[PDB]
Amino acid sequence: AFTVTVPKDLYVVEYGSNMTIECKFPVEKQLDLAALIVYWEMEDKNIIQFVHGEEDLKVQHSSYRQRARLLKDQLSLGNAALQITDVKLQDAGVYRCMISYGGADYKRITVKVNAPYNKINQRILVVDPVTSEHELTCQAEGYPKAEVIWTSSDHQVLSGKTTTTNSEKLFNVTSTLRINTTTNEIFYCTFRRLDPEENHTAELVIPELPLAH
């Protein structure tokens, strides 16, 4: 009947942030750390192997070194928590924790990762000064795949051309718009993706003297 309990079986965590994952195990009176054993794993990858108050660091995975730690402090309350920071995307997947202290049980938990596209990069250039043909360009990086919607100041949608591609596994999304326009005409690109439905809208203001390429 000795059982391990996880307060949350889900984690939706944004790229590069930090998260603590929690496991709970019965403790009465004071915790004997000689007799405590913890293991943290993610798919085929060990993460921590904590035997006898001493965390075995020869065996932790390469991809985790100096990133994810077992908080040694909470344990005394029966809470053995994995602390990872700078959530790296390839951490998305199913973890599971295993506690042998007098008895043993394990519970698995999963975590997925977002990466909003909220830093948008603009470029505005003329390609044909006579026809006033300009080229509006938004790019941005995130996870999972995104799509790009172009809109005129008067809120009409317009046809763009976009390219999705990879950075590590990150998505790089470029979209350009070729439309005749003049100075001080404002246009918008909004980046909309799925998963945790999210959107980020940039404003592009045509300059009097745009560059050309």
């Epitope: 054993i37 293991y39 794993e41 798919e43 085929d44 990858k45 060990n46 192997q49 035997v51 006898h52 075995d56 020869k58 065996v59 932790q60 995975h61 390469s62 599971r96 295993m98 042998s100 043993a104 394990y106």
Partner: antibody, heavy 118, light 108 residues
Framework: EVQLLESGGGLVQPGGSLRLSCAAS????????MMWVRQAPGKGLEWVSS????????FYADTVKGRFTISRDNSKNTLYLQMNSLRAEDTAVYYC?????????????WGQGTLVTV | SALTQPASVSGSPGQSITISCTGT?????????VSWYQQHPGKAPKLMIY???NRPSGVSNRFSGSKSGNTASLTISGLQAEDEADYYC??????????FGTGTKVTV
Amino acid sequence: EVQLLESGGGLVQPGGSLRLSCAASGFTFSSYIMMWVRQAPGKGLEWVSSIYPSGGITFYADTVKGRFTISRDNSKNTLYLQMNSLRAEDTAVYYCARIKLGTVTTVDYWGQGTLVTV
Amino acid sequence: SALTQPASVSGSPGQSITISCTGTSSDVGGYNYVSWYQQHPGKAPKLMIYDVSNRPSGVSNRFSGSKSGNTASLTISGLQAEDEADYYCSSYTSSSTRVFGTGTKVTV
């Protein structure tokens, strides 16, 4: 610089008992996940049992659940498999496989086996 | 539960050859952990590559590995006659288990 020596297998009746051992020489065996893997003659190779270094966490393949039990003495740096009421389908070669550090499931070094015949 | 490896392939010296390993959305096609093992008959299986392509120090560059979608492939180059042996692939699985392949027997 590493050796894994299976010993104890032989001819036993169906329903009998056999204790398979694995002598382990090599890296610090108190830190490794260890495993048993069986090869039926000519056939594919299947995983039977896992054991974590310490804490006594073990795992068994569904065919084998309940009549096989695995153990390990981290001082004597060896590994055992107790086989009870051997069925007829349980007759195959038995390998003792060390799990590469970091990786939960990936063996790297193996021993040469020992025969079990039902 | 098994990984399907075509049992019969073969080829002559100084040549390239590719064994195939296929499996489910839940094991070889879902994870980047697939390991390949080389053994001559009645001998001591040798890890050759791991984690889809990675090979440990001490395996000739003549061995690389590849995973395309659901299907994974072990390639031998500069092929020689010692390398004729039963070879197996393997993968982690959603059950936190390693499935192994039926094995292929390459012959020089």
